[PDB]
Amino acid sequence: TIKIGAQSMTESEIVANMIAQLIEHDTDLNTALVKNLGSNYVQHQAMLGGDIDISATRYSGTDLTSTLGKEAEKDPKKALNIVQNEFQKRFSYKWFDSYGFDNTYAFTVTKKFAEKEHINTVSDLKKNASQYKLGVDNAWLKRKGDGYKGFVSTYGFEFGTTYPMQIGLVYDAVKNGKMDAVLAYSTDGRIKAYDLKILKDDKRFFPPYDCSPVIPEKVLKEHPELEGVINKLIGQIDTETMQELNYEVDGKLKEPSVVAKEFLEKHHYFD
Numbered sequence: 001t002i003k004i005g006a007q008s009m010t011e012s013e014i015v016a017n018m019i020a021q022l023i024e025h026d027t028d029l030n031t032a033l034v035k036n037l038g039s040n041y042v043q044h045q046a047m048l049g050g051d052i053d054i055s056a057t058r059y060s061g062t063d064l065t066s067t068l069g070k071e072a073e074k075d076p077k078k079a080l081n082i083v084q085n086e087f088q089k090r091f092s093y094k095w096f097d098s099y100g101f102d103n104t105y106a107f108t109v110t111k112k113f114a115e116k117e118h119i120n121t122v123s124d125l126k127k128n129a130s131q132y133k134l135g136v137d138n139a140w141l142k143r144k145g146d147g148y149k150g151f152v153s154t155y156g157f158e159f160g161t162t163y164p165m166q167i168g169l170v171y172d173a174v175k176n177g178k179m180d181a182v183l184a185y186s187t188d189g190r191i192k193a194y195d196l197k198i199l200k201d202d203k204r205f206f207p208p209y210d211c212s213p214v215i216p217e218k219v220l221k222e223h224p225e226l227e228g229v230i231n232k233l234i235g236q237i238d239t240e241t242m243q244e245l246n247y248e249v250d251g252k253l254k255e256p257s258v259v260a261k262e263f264l265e266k267h268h269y270f271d
């Protein structure tokens with residue numbers, strides 16, 4: 001039984017269901033989802049513990065700064081190479097090449113608010129920053145390297161008030177004028193659907209967040225058919241497609257498993 005870990009993000013559940021289904025289509029391996037994992041730390045500890053054999057979604061910038069204790073590399077190619085080499089060297093874990101998308105933190109406002117306050121970049125927020133309410137996820141305020149503390153020393157301002165909440169709620173919160181700005185995730189389909197505006201990170205504070213699966217080399221050796229299955233998804237999901245997939249769950253309220261199945265069917269399970 002191949003155990004597949006999903007973080008409690010819509011995107012993680014879709015991709016975990018996708019891996020599960022493709023595995024059972026291609027092979028005789030049985031699969032189980034391990035859901036609601038709180039963070040990459042919980043994920044990483046679960047894999048060290050043998051509780052999961054596959055992380056469906058891990059993000060180069062997040063593990064670089066937290067699991068590996070390293071400085072936030074800002075170049076995508078370099079950050080991915082560093083994460084790949086370190087996961088091999090430290091754990092004999094294989095951090096695959098990316099699905100094809102970067103899911104980054106992104107400061108997001110409405111188009112009405114942008115035009116009113118004259119906002120195109122994150123730096124544009126500085127001028128009235130104490131008047132603003134920012135909605136953020138439940139972990140960002142406390143993160144090291146790529147969190148609020150680092151944000152403040154790079155950008156040289158803080159927001160009037162910051163509200164930590166479940167990520168899924170920040171999209172409606174900003175549409176509804178409850179928050180003035182939110183730290184959204186770039187792959188959420190609600191940015192498109194709600195016509196929200198992503199602000200340029202003009203000081204390149206955030207590292208890249210290219211998304212990949214992670215699997216111990218030991219699991220890959222035990223089940224040699226498994227690598228080829230995962231390889232089918234590498235490079236197949238660009239950010240536009242991930243946004244579309246996410247919205248099917250968060251906007252149309254479909255089950256991650258339904259959304260993953262229709263995607264695999266559209267692409268003929270990549271053979």
Ligand SMILES: C[N+](C)(C)CCO
Pocket residue numbers: 059062103104105185186209
């Ligand atoms: C998706 N992010 C990279 C934005 C944060 C970690 O989950």
